Every structure is written in C-alpha cells, then in structure tokens.
Design an enzyme around this catalytic site. Structure first.
Site, PDB file in Angstrom:
ATOM      1  N   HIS A  66      -7.700 -13.512   1.981  1.00 24.08           N
ATOM      2  CA  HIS A  66      -7.893 -12.139   1.546  1.00 24.08           C
ATOM      3  C   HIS A  66      -6.602 -11.500   1.044  1.00 24.08           C
ATOM      4  O   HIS A  66      -5.503 -11.882   1.445  1.00 24.08           O
ATOM      5  CB  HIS A  66      -8.486 -11.293   2.682  1.00 24.08           C
ATOM      6  CG  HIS A  66      -7.611 -11.206   3.895  1.00 24.08           C
ATOM      7  ND1 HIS A  66      -7.635 -12.150   4.900  1.00 24.08           N
ATOM      8  CD2 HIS A  66      -6.695 -10.282   4.271  1.00 24.08           C
ATOM      9  CE1 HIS A  66      -6.767 -11.815   5.838  1.00 24.08           C
ATOM     10  NE2 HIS A  66      -6.183 -10.686   5.481  1.00 24.08           N
ATOM     11  N   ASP A  80      -5.146  -7.624   1.070  1.00 21.53           N
ATOM     12  CA  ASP A  80      -5.474  -6.461   1.888  1.00 21.53           C
ATOM     13  C   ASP A  80      -6.089  -5.308   1.103  1.00 21.53           C
ATOM     14  O   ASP A  80      -5.636  -4.973   0.010  1.00 21.53           O
ATOM     15  CB  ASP A  80      -4.249  -5.992   2.673  1.00 21.53           C
ATOM     16  CG  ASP A  80      -3.904  -6.925   3.816  1.00 21.53           C
ATOM     17  OD1 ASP A  80      -4.819  -7.272   4.597  1.00 21.53           O
ATOM     18  OD2 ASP A  80      -2.725  -7.324   3.928  1.00 21.53           O
ATOM     19  N   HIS A 124      -3.424 -13.949   1.908  1.00 19.81           N
ATOM     20  CA  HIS A 124      -3.031 -14.628   3.136  1.00 19.81           C
ATOM     21  C   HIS A 124      -4.222 -14.934   4.039  1.00 19.81           C
ATOM     22  O   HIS A 124      -5.331 -14.445   3.818  1.00 19.81           O
ATOM     23  CB  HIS A 124      -1.924 -13.875   3.880  1.00 19.81           C
ATOM     24  CG  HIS A 124      -2.270 -12.461   4.222  1.00 19.81           C
ATOM     25  ND1 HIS A 124      -2.264 -11.447   3.288  1.00 19.81           N
ATOM     26  CD2 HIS A 124      -2.604 -11.885   5.402  1.00 19.81           C
ATOM     27  CE1 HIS A 124      -2.594 -10.310   3.873  1.00 19.81           C
ATOM     28  NE2 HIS A 124      -2.803 -10.547   5.156  1.00 19.81           N
ATOM     29  N   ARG A 128       2.325  -3.973  12.692  1.00 25.24           N
ATOM     30  CA  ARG A 128       2.279  -3.937  11.235  1.00 25.24           C
ATOM     31  C   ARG A 128       2.578  -2.557  10.665  1.00 25.24           C
ATOM     32  O   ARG A 128       2.015  -1.558  11.102  1.00 25.24           O
ATOM     33  CB  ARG A 128       0.912  -4.415  10.730  1.00 25.24           C
ATOM     34  CG  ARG A 128       0.724  -4.260   9.227  1.00 25.24           C
ATOM     35  CD  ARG A 128      -0.576  -4.885   8.754  1.00 25.24           C
ATOM     36  NE  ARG A 128      -1.743  -4.152   9.234  1.00 25.24           N
ATOM     37  CZ  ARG A 128      -2.904  -4.720   9.548  1.00 25.24           C
ATOM     38  NH1 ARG A 128      -3.054  -6.034   9.439  1.00 25.24           N
ATOM     39  NH2 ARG A 128      -3.914  -3.976   9.976  1.00 25.24           N
TER      40      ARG A 128
END
Ligand SMILES: O=C(O)CCC(=O)C(=O)O
Ligand SMILES: O=C(O)CCC(=O)C(=O)O
Ligand SMILES: O=C(O)CCC(=O)C(=O)O
Ligand SMILES: O=C(O)CCC(=O)C(=O)O
Lengths: 276, 276, 276, 276
Positions: C96, C98, C252, C267
């Site tokens: 995917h 993001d 990723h 994150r």
C-alpha cells in the site's frame, strides 16, 4: 434472388437463393465477396456439393492451397477430407486463426458438412474487427503498431509428436521449416481496410515490444476479450451446410463434445497474403 | 404432436407440437418436466401467448412469483414485462444465475419474446452440471462440500445503483434487506440429484473456506471454465419464442448488441427452495 | 559527519553521523532531504528519540498531521502510537501507499521502533520510480496520462468494521466523508520531477480510461510488476531504528509473522499535496 | 562458540563463532546440520575461504557434485566459479529451485561471496515449508498427493543459445538427455519429515492430475503464494559471506540490478536424492 441475412451485429450472415454447386455469375460472386467483407463468416444451408464443385466455388475468391500430403479427395487435391474416424480433431477445441505462424496465413476456407453426429459439434467464430473496436481507446492506441510472434509449436508441442527419439527429430525438422515469425498485433484487412485484433490462442506466444511478463498479461486479456459473446456467433451444423469465412480477421473454435460419433467435413483453403 | 429435440449434449432441447396457449395435458406437463430435468433449458418456437396464458403454463411447474415494484402486466401480477424502452438491460450481459443472493433463489423462469430487433440480442445458457463433471477429480473432490458467499451488491454496486444521496436511501435499504449469504459451491439438484457448479460471476464473491487470495484464483478459474463453449449454448431469438430454463443448475447471458433498438420480453418466475 | 550508504540500486539508504534527538543543522536537514529525493526511503540505526524529538525532526521536512482519537502520545498529538496490543495490524501486510484515497495523500512518515519482537515484522518498500522506468516503452506511453480511482473501502470493507446501529452509522459517515477519487496512474514527483507508478493494491480500484475488464488485467499486472525484487528492499528492524520514507513514490508492506509478540512503533506523518 | 541466530520466523539463520576455513568438530557439524533442518538457509559473515576449504566444508553435509568441464576450479572441480565477466546471470533473476528437472535435484549448496559490486545483487530465499502450512486446509488436502512436471526448457528454451547449427543438434541432444519428468507437488523432507510445496516458476510446467487450464490457474496461484514476503527473506551480500541452503524445501532468486559491475561467487553443490 441472392439473399443475405445477417445473423448478428458483430459478424455472420446466411445466404440463400444461389446454388454454389454450379458456376455462379460475376454478379453473384461479387455479391458474396461483399458479404464476406462485411459479415466475415457466411453460411448456406441445404447446399450439397461435391469436392470438384467445392473447389470450383472457392477458387472464385482466390487461389487454392494445393495439398497431396494431408487427407485428400484423390480427384481433387484442393479439397481436404476431415474425418474423425481417421484423424483426431480434439486440438481444434481451442480459439485459433488458421496457420498464423506462416508468413502468409490462409485468406479463408470453404467448409462442407458431409456426415454429422445426431447433435453436438458446434463451431464458433469471433470477429477481430468487432473485438478491436470494443477495446478502450488507450488500449487501441498502444496495440496498433505492435507486433506479435506466432509459433506452430504452441499448438503442436513436443509432447503431441511423441516421446520417442525419432518423434523428437521430426519435431525439430518441422520447426526448422516453420520457425517463429511475426505479424502485426492489429491487422489492416487487405481488401476492406478494416482494422482487427490479430492474435489467437492457438499460435500467438509473445507481443514482441513488451516484456515477457507484460506480454503474458496483455495476451491473457486479449484472448479472453476477443472471445466474449459480444464478438462471436455459434453455428449448429446440418448436413449439406456450407461455411465460408475470412481467416484474415476471425478466430474459430470447433467444439469437441460428440466423441466418439463420426463427423466428416470437406475443406478448401484459400491462400492469403502477408499481414500488415 | 409433442417432440423433444436435444440441441447440445451439455444442455438445451427444442419442443414442438404442443400448444401452450391452451392448457396442456398432465402427460405433456410431465414430459416437459422430465425434459427440463434432463436438458435444463427448453425452447419452443412459433408459440404466441398472452400474459395470462404464460402464467398458467408456468404455474404448472411450481409456484409463481408476485412482484409489485418491477414493471409487469396490469392484470397479471405474476408476469413481468421487460421493455428496453422502459428499463436498461446492459448488466444482463454478464454470466449470472438469477438471484443467488437469496436464501431460496429462483427455480427457473418462462420467457416469451414479444418484440425483437431485426437481429442481435442472443441469450446464452451454461450447464453447471456439465461444467462440474468436466472438472478434474482432485478439483471436484476439493470443491464438493465447500460454500460460497453470494452478494447482491456485486451486480448492484454503489456507483451503478444508488446514484443519488436520494436514491442511496433505496440502496442502503436493499443492502440491509439482502445481506451476504452462503450456498454450496457444488449444488445437488433438489429433484434429479444431479450435481452442478453453483457459482456465477454475477453474485459470487468468495469461497468461504479458502483465503481471500486463494478464493480469487479459484473463482477466476471456475468463472472461465463454467462458461467455455463445451458447457453452453447460444439462442437467436424469434418473436413468439418461449424459453424455459432451470435456474438451479444453469447460468445465462444476454448479449447487449442491439442498442438502441427496442426489445420486449415477458417473464414468469418460478419460486425455488434452498440450495443444498 | 553525515554519512549516506545506499542499500540497493532501486531505493533505500542508511544514514549515520547525525543525532536526530537534537535539532539538526540546516545543512544536515538539506543533506537528508536530498537523500530522500534520491533514495526514497532512509534508515537510521541506534537513534533513540522521544515523541517530542521525533516530531521536531519530522517537522523539518514538512507540515505534521494531528490526530487525537487515533492512539497517540498526549504530549505530542503529532506522534501516533502503533501498538499491536491495542490495534490489529494484520491489514498492513499488503502492498500500500498511505492514504491514497485522499486528495492529498501523505508526503511521507518518520517511524520509530520502540518495542520489537525477538524476530519478525520486517517492513518492505517498493520504488514507484524504478518500477515505472523498467516498463516497456509502449506501456509507459499508454499509462502516462491515465488516471485511477482510489477507495478506502478496498482496505476497509464495511464487513471489517461496524455492526452496531452506531457502528453502521459510523461507517456510512466515513464512506460519505471519503468518496472514491482519482489520481494520475503515473505521478510526477512534485520536487525532483521523477516519474513513478502511482497505484497500489491497498487502495487503487480502477484505471478510469479503461473498461472494468481491461483495468482489472492492467492492475493485476502492475501490482505484481511494481513489487518485484528488482524494485524493492526489505528492512530487518532493530530497537531505536528510525525509518523515513517518501510516500509520494513508494509502497510498503508490513510483514505480520510475529504474532502474538508485542510490537510498538511511533509514527509522525508529513502532510502531502495534490498528486499530478 | 558456535552460535545460531534466527533471522526470521519462516526461515533463515546466521551462524557465528566458528572458523570454516578449518575443519569443524563433529559437534559443530551436527549443530549446523540441525540448524539447516530448522531454518533451511544459513548465513555466515566474515568467513573467507578458498575452493579446497569450501569443498571440505560442504562435504561434511553430503556428497559433492563434480563439475568436470571447464573447472574452475582445476584442483577442486567440486567448486563452480560464477563470474559475471564470463557468464550472464540474468536467467537467475527468476524464482527457482535448483535443477528440479533432474530425478534427484540438488540437496543444497554452499555459496561463497568472492567479489561484489558496491551494492545490489541481493539474493532471496523462500520457504516451501512455511508456504505449504499457510495454505487453507482444502487446498492442502487437494495438493498433497498430486504430481508436477519439471522441464529444463522452461528456463533454458532454444532461443536462449542461438540458431548456430552446432547448438541445434547439441541442444537437441540436451533435451533428449533431460526429458520432462515428475515430482510430488508436496514434498516430504527426507530427513526432517516436514512437508513443503515443491513447485517453482523456474522449471515447473504442469500439475499432472489437473487439466492444462486448471493447472495453469493453480500454478499461477502457487507461484505467487510461495514467494510472498511472509515466506521469504532477503540477503544483502558482503565479501567473504557464506550461504548454505537446503534446496529440498526452498527456492531462491538472484536480483540482477548491478550490471555491468563484476560479481564473483564460488559454489559447491551437495548431491540430492529422489523427492517423495
Ligand atoms: O470447425 C469444423 O468443423 C472444422 C474444423 C476446423 O476447425 C476448421 O475447418 O478450421
Ligand atoms: O434473454 C433475455 O431476453 C434476457 C435474459 C435474462 O437476463 C432474463 O430475462 O432472465
Ligand atoms: O510498517 C510498519 O512498521 C507498520 C505500520 C505501517 O505499515 C506504516 O507505518 O505505514
Ligand atoms: O545467488 C547468487 O548470488 C548466485 C546465483 C544463484 O542464484 C545461485 O547461486 O544458484
């Protein structure tokens, strides 16, 4: 009284009011040529015809492929006998365009229904023209111009010859005579100028300008797309039927569902030119 | 009198010599029932019928469906009018088995051709039975006993139906009335005991016992396999044709190649039980 | 001082000789920015940092995203806590990019490894730039200019979250707030000008200028192509690692092979602009 | 102090505290053997060795394959030299298990990194044990007991060596001497007893008990499934590295992303038995 009855929008027409077991006039010949260029595959019922008459008819639409090697009618080496009692026709149950591995694939063929099983054994045709027209613009733009390799070993693999050493040598020998070659992916009809998808499952192995992986994906797409119901018709045979199709812009599929019942057909092949 | 002519080994027969505009005899009814159990889809030509006659003929083989919202005949609530002038039918051009998202999908239907385009608009049927028997043993073994999710929303997605936040109310309400439910991948006909593949690209989303990735690959395979020429037939409509198919073991496909020409069919749907 | 060691020709680079727990110099910032524009995904070993420092670092490379409800550190609403004991991450085990269903998908993210299992939980990255460049000329010609639909429901089906009267209202509201939208299939990096494939299996549902069937084939090809080894790297995490990737040109994949062992990452997400 | 460090749940381990440039104790030999059986692929860093030392090591784990032609290495023909300056390695950029077209494919191999490009040329390994276990139960049941054909010409087709007439009769004899043959789809490790998928994109052409169409779909599923991140590891080489893998339950992939930079490896092949 020559009558043309279209069978479906994509392709196919039935013809009546003409006895093709006899020499047809110039007008009739040209009327049928136009029907072929429009409908791509033509059908006539209740049209009994012997091999001599079948050859005389087919020769009106181009030069005939001469053959003394394949199952022939002795008197006429221009008409090929297809007999399920003599030759297995199982490998015809695949979508294919005839001899596209050749530099000049057949223009078309005239087929005669001699002996039929009670039922079963339908033949399907698909239009490369209609199929190509239905592709999205960007896909048409990309494919038009590309070339594809056609290889007889896709339909005639090593295992179809034999596992014996001499069967292997025969396969190498016929390969030397028919090495893989290329044709445009989008073929322009040499008479009508109509554009058509010109790949088929039987013989197309690779779209040359794409990578192996990309090609595999595109070809799987094109194989499934071009044989959709929208682009095809299905013929249920009767004895004395005659089919006349343009092999420059179609594929066909001989359904194998009637074994071991005997089925006999007569074929006359018309020679073609180099695809562009 | 009554004659039954098979059209193909896999499925399909044509019936003539029986006037279904009038009541049929118990013997005729039973003969047609057996024909349906054997050939799965039956065709009768030159058989004009009004809605009321269509309903009492259809009613001879099960209980009819009453639908108030969908376009039907004013006096005959059980006969549905399918008119391209009124309703668009583009998404019938996809292999589907009728309402398999219901607990008890339709047994089958009786379809009458009222008004047809000059040509085009063929319908194909495919035998789940023939398809299943043609699978390899290891595949029949693995599939027989598995279940699959059927989802109304696969044929009626948001973007195609429920196009307005006003019409979306109609979508959210149906999506809430018909949630995903399951059926056996291999169905046993409730009358004949004949086993059939019971998935269709129209409504089948997932084989429950396989993973997402596994299921996707298996369904792509089955969708292609079950609609190969070997397992199907193609019908070219003539006005006053009647089609009678068993929706418990077949799929069908309505080619949409006649736009914008008008096409009008009448359908009587027969209620089915739960697939097991 | 600052040292940049490329990990692989297609992408990825390790950086050392800079302490990012303190405010980095302008020159250091610009060195790291250049390395991001070149290598796309950057790694720093042995760089412990708290959420405060991690946010201060991330903000040197773009505006930071603020999300309260989603598990984060109270002191730093800019840093998000990703804890497998709190949130299931099974759905990160798919390729995917993001939030590509947003009109302005994230620029990138800075990720910190707080707690790690003994082994497992590798993260892979793929370069959209190297993938695009390796496509055949014809494919690049066709894709360059097309657009694709992105839909969060592809990763977040309604069957994944929501069952309560509230939960259903919870979903419909989200779907209402995040309708499918489009981005170019071939994205031009808004800084370097480098072209990248910009589709991902996580969110991309449809190539708009192709038919559903054509799109389906092309995406399957691209999903496979873009994630081949030639275009990707695989990071084996260590505690106090810091990863910094450009989400505008990469995908990723978070391997989920360490259950039920605990994994905690922090994150910081950098806001992006409109893809073109 | 022989130490074993697992790199990843599915497979892979690093071994240290042992000098394999010298003889190893029986205790060490057995530890490495057990590590091989558990982890399938083993890595040792900083282990410079010469051909003689390398053969002595590999010989401790089984009988070595002799390279009788153009050795390289002269005094130690058990060690093959893989130098890109002499041999094109592009073919190795495909997922494959070594020589599975042989009746007794290699047990495994010991590979030494002599000369590497600055970066690039990663090698990946995938575990057939982990891959098999991740399949659904129905799929495990169907596959376990089936057989597949392996054919060297899948990776080394005629158009790979040229029409140089010498190769036309020379290559023809190579296929005569290495005809297609079969192995179990699910292999039982002859030592550990662990079941593993034993098909690979490199040489596997057909699942025997399925039809070509079914086999095609299944192998496409398996090829993708077996090479998912969950089941694989990626090694970034350093000079003096040694890899030692079990070719009975894995497949591997050599990335070719470093041309034209020079790469030199030394390989010792351990002979294998008949898969069951
Ligand atoms: O279709 C037929 O029946 C004849 C076999 C065939 O495929 C052809 O003649 O090209
Ligand atoms: O064949 C047609 O007229 C429609 C086919 C179909 O979708 C139906 O009416 O069941
Ligand atoms: O990659 C990770 O470490 C897990 C979370 C994730 O995939 C991401 O940060 O986008
Ligand atoms: O893996 C390498 O580096 C060498 C080429 C290969 O794949 C092998 O060793 O079999």
């Amino acid at each position: 009284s020559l009558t043309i009855t279209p069978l479906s929008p994509a392709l196919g027409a039935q013809i009546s009011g003409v006895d093709i077991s006899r020499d047809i006039s110039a007008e009739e010949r040209d009327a049928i040529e136009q029907a072929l260029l429009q409908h791509q595959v033509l059908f006539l019922r209740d049209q009994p015809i012997n091999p001599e008459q079948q050859a005389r008819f087919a020769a009106r639409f181009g030069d005939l492929h001469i053959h003394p090697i394949y199952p022939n009618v002795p008197d006429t080496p221009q008409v090929l006998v297809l007999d399920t009692a003599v030759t297995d026709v199982r490998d015809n149950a695949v979508w294919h365009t005839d001899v596209t591995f050749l530099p000049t694939p057949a223009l078309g063929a005239v087929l005669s229904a001699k002996q039929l099983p009670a039922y079963g054994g339908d033949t399907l045709w698909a239009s490369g023209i209609a199929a190509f027209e239905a592709l999205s613009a960007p896909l048409r733009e990309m494919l038009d111009g590309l070339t594809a390799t056609h290889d007889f070993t896709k339909s005639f693999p090593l295992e179809r010859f034999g596992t014996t050493p001499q069967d292997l040598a025969r396969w190498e020998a016929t390969r030397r005579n028919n090495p893989p070659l290329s044709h445009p992916v989008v073929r322009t009809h040499p008479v009508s100028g109509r554009k058509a998808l010109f790949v088929n499952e039987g013989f197309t192995t690779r779209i040359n300008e794409l990578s192996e992986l990309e090609s595999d994906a595109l070809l799987r797409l094109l194989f499934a797309h071009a044989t959709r119901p929208e682009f095809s018709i299905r013929w249920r045979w009767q004895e004395n039927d005659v089919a006349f199709w343009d092999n420059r812009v179609t594929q066909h599929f001989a359904v194998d569902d009637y074994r071991p019942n005997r089925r006999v057909m007569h074929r006359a092949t018309i020679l073609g030119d180099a695809p562009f």
